[PDB]
């Protein structure tokens, strides 16, 4: 034993257990989830109001990379931003010499390649968040989980942090019901349901919901937050399902 | 007990980093074979979808590492990426220096001397991965060439790698006994698949759809994956004769 | 210098003239200019002496470690993309004007390299300061499915059309000859046209001739030892 | 130098003399100008002729490891890394880049890149020493959509007066055509284009 | 202002019939002024013989540079250095200092211990090898020494002849060249003797 | 207990105790209020003397002229991190001609703490900050931990006894959020948010610290008879 | 991180000994004995081979007696390959010394400098130290002959005679019992091959184990030779001093 | 994304021993098999082709390899070490010596070479030991022929004829007993084959054996002809014909 004491290093399994450790950290994470729809993405969170003294919409967590890729992550909430301004210099370098936007499975080994560079040396750590992020690209929408291993694959619906096997149950009903594909509009409504669904493993505290979106149709290809009136209308949506 | 956690020797004269890392490439639980008929090196690897919320387009274990190099991985991705990255760097960067397409031996070689220096070095891990890489080299012909985290590398007639390796491997050394040459004599690479996945379907006693499988084929001048139709199309012949 | 290379029916030919100079005194009337990068890849030199050769011993170096490395015969490319990124990367400051030719298992080939890192695919070529003397021959001669003992005589009449009308070029003509499944065959001194004449008088001196003013002996070797 | 590339229905055309001159000697009279960095997106060097092929043997190499990535490259892809090298590097190169692509989304596209290293998307582009005697010439004489057949006389008979009024220009007429189809080599001597 | 010609100076080498001759002035200068008629630019490292002719603060380094690289091959290697191997290294030191070079013309002569052959080399300041059969000439009246050479010399001569030889192609030379002179010395070289000759000359 | 000895390492719950160690540091340190308005924001400090000979420690920092925070922990961390932040606020100014805004502050403290938790060698921050500011989207107050989480709030306090007067605050919210164009009401407010965090000791003149930022008001300290009006 | 794996090779114990020396050391006196032996005309170095086997080349073999110029010699002790490392720096030193003045380095100045360098590897860098003692046999025309010793600690002493590697107490014991200060170089050569003969773990001392040297001023003219001993040589000074 | 292991990872023990180097001397015992003998006019090196698996193409597998023209080695121990090995050797008989000298270096400094790169695997900080040793065969002008081991502490010593890892103190035994000063090359090829024979335990013939010889100039191998002075390589690996037909006289 002391296998588990130093990050790189294997296991008699075969196994990396600080990454496994790091696994911990986002399964204690608020729930956060990806959508993919017919010409795009959507993008929804968890947000606990730990106090009525935290300020309504203003402690946004999703974030945007470029201008069409959006990325949400459940764990300890620095790691993922540190890895979003890695992602943002992947894609203006990216930009800078090949002109056009990182394509999303580009930019989705550029953070992979990145975080499973934390897992190469005991002189660091690895990541203690799971990262849902995509967009769209030349050749259409793509939805991307990323683990803290460095491990990322395609999604049709993906889910992490602690309201995962909920919303995992919810989004595979949905890829059975709807296989000719879903639309923009519905996947926030349904983006609403199931946050509001995975809410019961962290009922405890109230919660905010927090929306995103890219989609060709509804947003030009380009990263934009559900706002005003589509927001009101997809929690009343997800109130209505629960009820 | 500190001999066990990084890269220097055991009592035994053993590095059990090594030896960990040979075991992290199973963690898939995916088997790989490869074969080379007159003018092509197939490989073929399992493909495993278990859940439904994934976009199988996305799972694969096999890299076009060059337009005529291929190389299919037995361990887990983020490692197989690595490898990969590095991999279409070294081929890159040779083409680039000496002006000819690096060798599918050559860049083994490259990559398996890497692997060395993480058994040797202490800071870097080794990667827990087994790489096949794949091609009809211009001068060599159609080729074979593994590593491992130990920095091993050689040249194979057939190969396979995964948890059932030896089941494969005894299947593809009886037949090379009975036919008593060193490749597949078979004109069409369509027809070295068929072989290939006949063989693999003997060894492992299961049978496969469509999704059940993913296929490398190098040619002269081109390695390419086939897409699930293709595979299909493999599937049927075998199973109208 | 001049020097050139031709293609002919299954090979490549290299040639070259024997002088160096210095300002326009004759530095060596016997240098060898054709060099040994492979077994069968072979490089002219012109321009800086020193630096054409020290280029093509750099590359030929490179190209052992390299063929050793990968356990193939070498290829032309290679060390036309070695000597041109490192000429390249120098921008002119190493003078040196090279013509590669040599075999391989993609087959002959024929280039030439200049000083600032640009390269040439050609049938016939030459560099140097007899260039244009030798170019006008290849030009007036040279064509399509050369027998080997037509292309030998006209590389050499190339390099001595150099000899003659260029000052820069002088002395001997060295030849190589690279066909395809054989050995290639370095001649130096293929040609002898100016070997000097007799002299008229010995001009060796009665001894004591020369006034001396000190004798001794030196110790060279190591220990005068007990 | 005369070089040339010239979109048209199909795709795209480039065009070259074959003439590499050391002042007033013709170094090679059978050079090729028109240079391979993938397979549908080639392009004509001017200059130095050791600044243009380091440049574009250093974009092979880039555009190589973008396939071995993320897949073919567009034509602007290719523009972009040839811009970059040349603006970057402008205080110590002599660089003058046509770059022409068939894509089967964009179709053909040339982007010209000029001494400053800056970028210009234009229906047809032309360069070189030779190309200041024929602006006139192909202002006139260019269509948009033109046939094969068409774009093929409009290079011939641009070129030809190029090589007719510049020294630094002459020998073979190189061609070399994109489309969908794939990649054709064009040659025509001297006895063809100089009695046009 | 030419590092070449501040100090002056010359060297000449020769083959004879199972022997070698090399031979200096011992002028050292500052232009017009005469310093010293006692700087020899002939050293040797076991039985190789290095003449260096140029700059006189290289010709003194370049002696220390050999002497150090002599040494420990000797120790490494445990047998005295060869002249062709010595010639090699010579030339690689030069080249190293390809774009700041030392400003010399060095000479290389000494018989082969193993082989029994005369050989004799020179080299350009950046390292480029001269290896004549004949005769290898370097310094400020290189020019004359090249004429006295060319039609003095002739192949297979005896020791003590070819001492004659080299003698009046250097005084001769010397005499026509305003930098050199102020005396001479002249090394004949067998395979197991060497002797030492200080020639009479003109002293302006 | 094992994974302790440094912030390179995860225990097997997925905790980082070096980081929850230096969160400890924070509790140690005496009791600092934050509060806002739409017009204004007021940070409230209970100073720390060592002995009755002693000065008070000062716990308020200014950044920027719209912008400052208060400290609770390690003094010299927060000097660190205020000099990043006047750097940053400095950086925005001379480039931009550009106040920092107080939102993007808070991203640029969290990013700086971060880079201390995942590699070697550091060791986390160990001191939280309370950073008020006035700018284009109005007032903010933000509330900073050495973890790297950095959270907006109409109001909080931080330090030693800390959940009484944030008690308070969260029953005041109605109230104090409507205090605009009124200053001395504000700071009314928050100097009776801070004394539900007090015990034994009580609010003298050289013991209180108090801090302004707002509409047509810079961020100005005032110490010493400048908060006697307030006790 | 990585400071869990750190030996600290360059620590203090609590007595103020430092570890990795003493156990180099301890290495050091399993190794084969080396002794230097200065007379007044000359100095002798003996050296006993380690590894008996029929099958060793002895006569291109070197272990224990190397050449650092014309004039300094060493005898080794310790680990080989890393003598090997420290003799081609103490080659260069020598070279570099000559090359600035002129003059070839004095004994003392050597040794200072290799000492000095294996004083480092003690103090700082976290590395190993250099397993190796050194008897240095020399000659300069301040102080004539010298016989030094450095150990891996890099502190070094001058003798007139002495002995480093296995059975050393025992070896210095015998030296002091015979040693006189007006003795000479056949009579230090006797007396060297006397001691290991002696204080050998074999069961006799035979040529096929020995390395010999010799710096005598008895050259031709007043000249300083250094004598490597060839095997037939060694030979036969076993016979003539009686020994075999 | 530091390298922070700039600390020794051989250290001494109490006891006085280099752990990491008697390890790796351990790993070296386990490898497979291999032998030097000397002859008056060459010397000859040979191991067992042990093969991993009978689909892999045991020829692409150089367990003997040319390092100059005039110099070979071969090893027991760890594989993937004693290529780099080759790697750094081919290299450093360019650059410190052929780069200078305009020649290849003799036997004994490349050797030398060698053993200094193995040496500092053995100081330097965050590494191990090389787990190889090595037996290296040579000609040169001045010493003639040589043959010498190297060893992970990065001591070398020459030898008449030696064995190194499995079976070598048996081997040694037995060249002990055939070994003399008058042996010519091919008596010295059938002492290496009867040698090599008693630690194979399975198949026994050029397929399985690789053995190569330092021996006469081969113009033959060279691949051009024109000077007079380059006559070939001495070092030439036997063909799996060439041992067969020895293996028939033995
Ligand atoms: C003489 C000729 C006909 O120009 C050839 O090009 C000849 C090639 C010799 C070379 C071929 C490859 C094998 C090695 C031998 N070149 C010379 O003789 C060369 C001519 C020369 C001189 C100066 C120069 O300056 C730009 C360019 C070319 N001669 C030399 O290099 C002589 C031996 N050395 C010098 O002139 C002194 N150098 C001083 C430092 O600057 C370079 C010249
Ligand atoms: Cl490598
Ligand atoms: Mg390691
Ligand atoms: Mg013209
Ligand atoms: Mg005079
Ligand atoms: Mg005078």
Request: aromatic share 8%; charged share 25%.
């Amino acid at each position: 034993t002391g296998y588990d004491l130093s990050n790189s290093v294997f296991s008699p399994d075969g196994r990396n257990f600080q990454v496994e450790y790091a696994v911990k950290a986002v399964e204690n994470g608020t729930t956060s989830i990806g959508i993919k729809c017919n010409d795009g993405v959507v993008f929804a969170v968890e947000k606990l109001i730990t106090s009525k003294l935290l300020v309504p919409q203003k402690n946004v967590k999703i974030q945007v990379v470029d201008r069409h890729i959006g990325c949400v992550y459940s764990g300890l909430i620095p790691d993922g931003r540190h890895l979003v301004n890695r992602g943002r210099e992947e894609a203006a370098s990216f930009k800078k010499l090949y002109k056009t936007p990182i394509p999303i499975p580009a930019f989705a080994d550029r953070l992979g390649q990145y975080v499973q560079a934390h897992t190469l040396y005991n002189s660091v750590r690895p990541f203690g968040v799971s990262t849902i992020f995509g967009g769209v690209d030349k050749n259409g929408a793509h939805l991307y989980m990323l683990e803290p291993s460095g491990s990322y694959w395609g999604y049709k619906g993906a889910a992490t942090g602690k309201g995962r096997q909920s919303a995992k149950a919810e989004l595979e009903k949905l890829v059975d019901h709807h296989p000719e594909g879903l639309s923009a509009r519905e996947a926030v409504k349904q983006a609403a349901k199931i946050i509001y669904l995975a809410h019961e493993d962290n009922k405890e505290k109230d919660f905010e919901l927090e929306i995103s979106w890219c989609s060709l149709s509804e947003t030009n290809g380009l990263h934009k937050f559900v706002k005003g009136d589509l927001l009101q209308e997809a929690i009343d949506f997800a109130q209505k399902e629960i009820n | 007990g500190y001999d066990r956690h990084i890269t220097i020797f055991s009592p035994e004269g053993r590095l059990y980093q090594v030896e960990y890392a040979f075991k992290a490439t199973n963690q898939t639980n995916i088997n790989s074979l490869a074969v080379r008929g007159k003018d092509c090196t197939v490989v073929i690897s399992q493909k495993k979808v278990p859940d439904k919320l994934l976009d199988p387009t996305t799972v694969s274990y096999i890299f076009c590492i060059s337009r005529t190099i291929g190389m299919v991985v037995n361990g887990p991705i983020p490692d197989a990426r690595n490898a990969a990255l590095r991999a279409k760097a070294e081929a890159a960067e040779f083409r680039y220096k000496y002006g000819y397409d690096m060798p599918c031996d050559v860049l083994a070689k490259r990559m398996a001397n890497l692997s060395q220096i993480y058994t040797q070095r202490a800071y870097m891990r080794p990667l827990g991965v087994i790489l096949t890489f794949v091609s009809v080299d211009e001068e060599l012909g159609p080729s074979i060439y593994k590593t491992d985290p130990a920095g091993y590398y050689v040249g194979y007639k057939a190969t396979a790698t995964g948890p059932k390796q030896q089941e494969i491997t005894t299947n593809l050394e009886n037949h090379f006994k009975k036919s008593k040459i060193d490749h597949i004599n078979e004109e069409s690479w369509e027809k070295v698949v068929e072989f290939a996945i006949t063989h693999m379907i003997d060894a492992l006693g299961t049978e496969f759809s469509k999704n059940d499988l993913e296929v490398g084929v190098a040619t002269k001048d081109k390695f390419f994956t086939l897409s699930a139709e293709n595979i299909e199309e493999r599937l049927v012949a075998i199973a109208e004769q | 210098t001049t020097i050139a290379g031709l293609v002919f029916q299954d090979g490549v030919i290299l040639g070259a003239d024997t002088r160096a100079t210095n300002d326009s005194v004759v530095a060596d009337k016997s240098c060898e200019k054709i060099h040994f990068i492979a077994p069968k890849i072979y490089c002219c030199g012109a321009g800086v002496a020193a630096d054409a050769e020290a280029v093509t011993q750099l590359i030929g170096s490179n190209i052992e470690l390299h063929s050793l490395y990968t356990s193939r015969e070498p290829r032309v490319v290679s060390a036309l993309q070695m000597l041109k990124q490192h000429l390249f990367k120098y921008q002119g400051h190493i003078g040196a004007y090279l013509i590669v030719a040599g075999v391989d298992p993609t087959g002959s080939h024929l280039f030439s390299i200049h000083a600032h890192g640009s390269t040439d695919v050609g049938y016939y070529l030459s560099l140097g300061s007899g260039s244009l003397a030798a170019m006008a021959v290849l030009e007036s001669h040279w064509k399509q499915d050369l027998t080997k003992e037509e292309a030998i005589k006209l590389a050499s009449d190339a390099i001595q059309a150099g000899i003659w009308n260029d000052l820069g070029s002088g002395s001997n003509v060295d030849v190589c000859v690279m066909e395809i499944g054989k050995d290639a065959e370095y001649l130096r001194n293929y040609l002898t046209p100016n070997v000097r004449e007799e002299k008229q008088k010995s001009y060796k001196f009665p001894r004591g001739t020369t006034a001396v003013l000190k004798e001794s002996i030196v110790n060279i070797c190591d220990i005068q030892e007990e | 130098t005369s070089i040339m590339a010239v979109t048209f229905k199909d795709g795209v055309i480039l065009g070259a003399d074959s003439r590499t001159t050391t002042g007033a000697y013709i170094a090679n009279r059978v050079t090729d100008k028109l240079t391979r960095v993938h397979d549908k997106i080639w392009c004509c060097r001017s200059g130095s002729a050791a600044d243009t092929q380091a440049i574009a043997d250093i974009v092979q190499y880039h555009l190589e490891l973008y396939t071995s990535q993320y897949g073919t490259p567009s034509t602007e892809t290719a523009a972009s890394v040839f811009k970059e090298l040349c603006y970057e590097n402008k205080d110590n190169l002599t660089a003058g880049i046509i770059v022409a692509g068939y894509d089967d989304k964009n179709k053909g596209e040339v982007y010209t890149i000029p001494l400053g290293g800056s970028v210009h998307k234009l229906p047809y582009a032309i360069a070189g020493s030779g190309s200041t005697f024929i602006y006139g010439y192909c202002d006139k004489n260019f269509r948009e959509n033109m046939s094969k057949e068409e774009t093929v006389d409009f290079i011939k008979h641009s070129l030809s007066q190029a090589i007719k009024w510049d020294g630094s220009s002459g020998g073979v007429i190189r061609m070399v055509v994109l489309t969908a189809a794939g990649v054709e080599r064009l040659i025509f001597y001297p006895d063809e284009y100089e009695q046009l | 202002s030419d590092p070449s010609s501040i100090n002056g100076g010359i060297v000449v080498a020769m083959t004879g019939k199972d022997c070698v001759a090399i031979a200096c002035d011992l002028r050292l200068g500052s232009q017009s002024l005469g310093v010293s008629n006692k700087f020899e630019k002939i050293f040797h490292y076991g039985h190789v013989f290095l003449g260096i002719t140029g700059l006189a603060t290289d010709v003194t380094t370049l002696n220390e540079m050999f002497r150090y690289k002599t040494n420990l091959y000797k120790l490494k290697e445990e047998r005295a250095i060869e002249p062709e191997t010595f010639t090699q290294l010579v030339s690689s030191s030069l080249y190293e200092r390809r774009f700041g070079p030392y400003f010399v013309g060095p000479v290389v002569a000494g018989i082969n211990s193993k082989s029994g052959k005369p050989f004799i080399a020179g080299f350009d300041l950046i390292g480029c090898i001269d290896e004549a059969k004949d005769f290898i000439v370097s310094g400020t009246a290189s020019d004359q020494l090249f004429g006295m050479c060319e039609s003095l010399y002739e192949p297979n001569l005896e020791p003590e002849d070819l001492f004659e030889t080299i003698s009046q192609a250097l005084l001769n030379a010397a005499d026509r060249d305003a930098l050199s002179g102020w005396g001479a010395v002249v090394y004949i070289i067998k395979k197991d003797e060497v002797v030492k000759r200080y020639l009479k000359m003109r002293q302006d | 207990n094992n994974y302790d000895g440094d912030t390179v390492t995860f225990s097997p719950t997925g905790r980082l105790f070096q980081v929850e160690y230096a969160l400890e540091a924070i509790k140690q340190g005496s009791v600092t209020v934050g509060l806002r308005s739409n017009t204004h924001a007021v940070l409230v400090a209970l100073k720390r003397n060592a002995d009755e000979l002693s000065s008070y420690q000062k716990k308020i920092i200014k950044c920027d002229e719209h912008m400052g925070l208060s400290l609770a922990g390690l003094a010299p961390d927060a000097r660190v991190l205020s000099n990043y932040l006047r750097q940053q606020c400095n950086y925005s100014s001379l480039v931009f001609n550009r106040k920092l805004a107080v939102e993007r502050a808070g991203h640029l403290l969290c990013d700086k703490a971060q880079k201390n938790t995942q590699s070697y060698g550091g060791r986390p921050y160990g001191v939280g900050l309370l950073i008020i500011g006035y700018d284009k989207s109005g007032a903010h107050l933000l509330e900073f931990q050495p973890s790297g989480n950095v959270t907006e709030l109409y109001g909080t306090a931080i330090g030693a006894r800390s959940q009484g007067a944030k008690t308070y605050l969260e029953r005041t919210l109605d109230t104090f959020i409507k205090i605009d164009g009124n200053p001395d009401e504000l700071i009314k407010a928050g100097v009776e948010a801070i004394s539900q965090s007090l015990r034994d000791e009580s609010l003298t003149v050289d013991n209180l610290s108090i801090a302004i930022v707002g509409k047509d008001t810079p961020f100005t300290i005032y110490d010493g008879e400048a908060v006697a009006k307030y006790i | 991180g990585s400071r869990r794996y750190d030996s600290r090779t360059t620590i203090f114990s609590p007595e103020g000994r430092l570890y990795q020396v003493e156990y180099a050391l301890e290495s050091i006196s399993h190794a084969g004995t080396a002794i230097g032996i200065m007379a007044s005309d000359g100095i002798v170095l003996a050296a006993e081979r380690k590894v008996t086997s029929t099958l060793l080349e002895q006569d291109t073999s070197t272990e224990k007696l190397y050449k650092l110029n014309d004039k300094i010699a060493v005898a080794v002790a310790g680990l080989t390959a890393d003598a090997e490392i420290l003799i081609n720096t103490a080659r260069i030193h020598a070279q570099n010394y000559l090359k600035t003045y002129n003059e070839d380095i004095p004994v003392e100045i050597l040794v200072r400098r290799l000492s000095d360098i294996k004083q480092g590897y003690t103090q700082h860098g976290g590395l190993r130290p250099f397993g190796v003692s050194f008897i240095y046999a020399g000659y300069d025309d301040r102080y004539g002959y010298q016989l030094y010793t450095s150990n891996p600690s890099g502190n070094y002493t001058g003798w007139k005679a002495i002995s480093v590697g296995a059975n050393t107490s025992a070896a210095q014991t015998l030296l002091q019992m015979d040693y006189k200060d007006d003795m000479k170089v056949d009579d230090a050569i006797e007396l060297a091959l006397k001691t290991l003969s002696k204080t050998t773990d074999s069961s006799a001392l035979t040529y096929d184990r020995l390395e010999f040297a010799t710096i005598r001023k008895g050259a031709n003219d007043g000249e300083v030779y250094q004598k490597i001993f060839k095997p037939q040589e060694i030979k036969d000074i076993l016979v003539k001093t009686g020994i075999t | 994304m530091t390298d922070r292991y700039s600390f020794s990872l051989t250290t001494f023990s109490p006891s006085g021993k280099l752990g990491q180097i008697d390890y790796a001397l351990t790993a070296v015992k386990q490898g497979v098999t291999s032998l030097g003998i000397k002859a008056t006019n060459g010397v000859v090196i040979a191991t067992e082709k042990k093969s991993s698996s009978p689909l892999a193409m045991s020829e692409t597998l150089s367990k003997v390899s040319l390092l100059t023209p005039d110099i070979g080695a071969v090893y027991s121990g760890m594989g993937p070490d004693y290529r780099v090995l080759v790697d750094k050797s081919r290299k450093v008989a360019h650059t410190s010596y052929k780069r200078i000298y305009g020649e290849y270096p003799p036997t004994k400094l490349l050797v030398s070479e060698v053993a200094k790169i193995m040496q500092e695997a053995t100081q330097s900080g965050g590494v191990r030991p090389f787990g190889v040793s090595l037996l290296i065969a040579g000609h040169d002008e001045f010493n003639g022929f040589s043959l010498y081991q190297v060893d992970p502490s990065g001591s070398y010593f020459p030898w008449k004829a030696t064995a190194i890892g499995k079976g070598s103190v048996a081997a040694k035994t037995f060249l002990e007993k055939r070994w003399n000063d008058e042996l010519e090359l091919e008596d010295a090829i059938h002492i290496a084959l009867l040698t090599l024979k008693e630690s194979v335990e399975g198949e026994f013939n050029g397929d399985t054996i690789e053995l190569a010889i330092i021996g006469d100039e081969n113009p033959d191998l060279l691949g051009y002809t024109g000077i007079p002075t380059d006559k070939g390589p001495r070092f030439r690996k036997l063909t799996s014909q060439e041992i067969n037909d020895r293996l028939e006289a033995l």
